[PDB]
Design a protein around this ligand. Structure first.
Ligand SMILES: COC[C@H]1CN(Cc2ccccn2)C(=O)[C@@H]2CCC[C@H]1N2S(=O)(=O)c1ccc2ncsc2c1
Length: 128
């Protein structure tokens, strides 16, 4: 399925080249521009654990998830991966625990040492 495919066929987008964050572009977005550090970014996403369970979805809430890019408001894999996206892009990201919740996990939904799968859609980005 999609998690296997990004694991085996994804691009390593880490600066360290440690395969900690792998990406596939699923829907090509608009032009060349990507958000910059500090932009307000608006996304839709779904996240799955390596056991196949969906742990979260913004579409199920009928509202986007909003954060300031590059400020550690989200897991490292998102600061790295959303920074690569064009407006309107949909991507798959495979996030090893060192770029996610590590050995701590996130109680209650994410276990220790969890590799996470996301589908992310970059809806918009704005400088405030
Ligand atoms: C609604 O969740 C928003 C956001 C959470 N954070 C930041 C954060 C703040 C405080 C504590 C932990 N994490 C994230 O970095 C990542 C990536 C952005 C999207 C979300 N997650 S998540 O991995 O999908 C996730 C993780 C745990 C969780 N518990 C129940 S729902 C759920 C969602």
């Amino acid at each position: 399925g999609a998690p296997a495919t990004v694991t085996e066929q994804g691009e390593d987008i880490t600066s360290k080249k440690d395969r900690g964050v792998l990406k596939i572009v699923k829907r090509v977005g608009n032009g060349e521009e990507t958000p910059m550090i500090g932009d307000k970014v608006y996304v839709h996403y779904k996240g799955k654990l390596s056991n196949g369970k969906k742990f979260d979805s913004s579409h199920d809430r009928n509202e986007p998830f909003v954060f300031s890019l590059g400020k550690g408001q989200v897991i490292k894999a998102w600061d790295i991966g959303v920074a690569t996206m064009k407006k309107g892009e949909i991507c798959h990201l495979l996030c090893k625990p060192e770029y996610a919740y590590g050995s701590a996990g996130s109680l209650p939904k994410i276990p220790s040492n969890a590799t996470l799968f996301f589908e992310i859609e970059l809806l918009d980005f704005k400088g405030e």
